[PDB]
Amino acid sequence: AQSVPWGISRVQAPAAHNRGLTGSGVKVAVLDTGISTHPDLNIRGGASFVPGEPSTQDGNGHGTHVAGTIAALNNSIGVLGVAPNAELYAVKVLGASGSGSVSSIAQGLEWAGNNGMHVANLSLGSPSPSATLEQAVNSATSRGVLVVAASGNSGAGSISYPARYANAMAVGATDQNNNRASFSQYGAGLDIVAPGVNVQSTYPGSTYASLNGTSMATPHVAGAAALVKQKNPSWSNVQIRNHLKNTATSLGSTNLYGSGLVNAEAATR
Known part of the structure; x- marks a missing residue:
C-alpha cells in the first residue's frame, strides 16, 4: 500500500495495515532528543527533562526517524511505519549532544513509571552504569512499562545499557534476511x-532521508508490539511478551538469535 524500504517490508507491517488493525488506542514513548515537527508524526505527548532545551520538536534528526519507525502516519505521503496513529509521545531523555546524564535516562525511565504509557523505547546505551538508572527501571516495572532498548553498533561482547538488563529488551540489527x-x-x-x-523515513524541513543502524530497526519491534497491545487493550506488558514471543520468528541457536525476526502477520492474523 504505502512506500517502505526492505526494512518494513520484512516486518509484515503492511499486511497488518490491510487487515484492519491500526494500533490506534496504544501509547509508546520515544526517549530521544527531537522528533522533528512534521505532518506525518502526530505528537500526542512529550516531556523534556535533560538540560539543554532546543525544542520539544526537532533538534537532531534520529529521534524523528525512530518516530516514523514506531508509527509513521499512513497518509500515503512519506514512508509508513508499523503503526498508523497510536499515541506517539516524545520523551526527550537524551540531549542532541550525544547522551544526557544518568539523571536524564533515569528521570526519563521514571517519568514513564507514571505517564510512561504501556510501551517505551530506548535507542541508547552508555558504558557508564548507575544505580540511579536502576531506580528508574524500578519505577518502570512498579507500574508496568514495556521497554525495548536497542543493541548498539559494535562495541565489546555486550549490548547497550541498560538494554542488557533493567527489564528492558534489547534489539539487534540483521543482514540480507536474518544473518547477523x-x-x-x-x-x-x-x-x-x-x-x-x-x-x-521522515526528516525535518519537510524532507525524508535514509540511514542504516540497529537504532532504527529497534523501534520497528517496539511498534509491532504496539499493534499487539492494540488487539488487546486489557492485556499487560507481560501477557504481551507472551504473544510477541511465540509470534516473533525464532532463528533458534542457544542465545545469539533466539527469536530475532518479527512479523505482525503472526501477531495479528
Whole structure:
C-alpha cells in the first residue's frame, strides 16, 4: 500500500495495515532528543527533562526517524511505519549532544513509571552504569512499562545499557534476511533483531532521508508490539511478551538469535 524500504517490508507491517488493525488506542514513548515537527508524526505527548532545551520538536534528526519507525502516519505521503496513529509521545531523555546524564535516562525511565504509557523505547546505551538508572527501571516495572532498548553498533561482547538488563529488551540489527548484520553488537542477553542496513523515513524541513543502524530497526519491534497491545487493550506488558514471543520468528541457536525476526502477520492474523 504505502512506500517502505526492505526494512518494513520484512516486518509484515503492511499486511497488518490491510487487515484492519491500526494500533490506534496504544501509547509508546520515544526517549530521544527531537522528533522533528512534521505532518506525518502526530505528537500526542512529550516531556523534556535533560538540560539543554532546543525544542520539544526537532533538534537532531534520529529521534524523528525512530518516530516514523514506531508509527509513521499512513497518509500515503512519506514512508509508513508499523503503526498508523497510536499515541506517539516524545520523551526527550537524551540531549542532541550525544547522551544526557544518568539523571536524564533515569528521570526519563521514571517519568514513564507514571505517564510512561504501556510501551517505551530506548535507542541508547552508555558504558557508564548507575544505580540511579536502576531506580528508574524500578519505577518502570512498579507500574508496568514495556521497554525495548536497542543493541548498539559494535562495541565489546555486550549490548547497550541498560538494554542488557533493567527489564528492558534489547534489539539487534540483521543482514540480507536474518544473518547477523556487520555492525550490530551482541552479548549474553539479546532479545530480538531486524533489518537495520538502510531505512528511509521522515526528516525535518519537510524532507525524508535514509540511514542504516540497529537504532532504527529497534523501534520497528517496539511498534509491532504496539499493534499487539492494540488487539488487546486489557492485556499487560507481560501477557504481551507472551504473544510477541511465540509470534516473533525464532532463528533458534542457544542465545545469539533466539527469536530475532518479527512479523505482525503472526501477531495479528
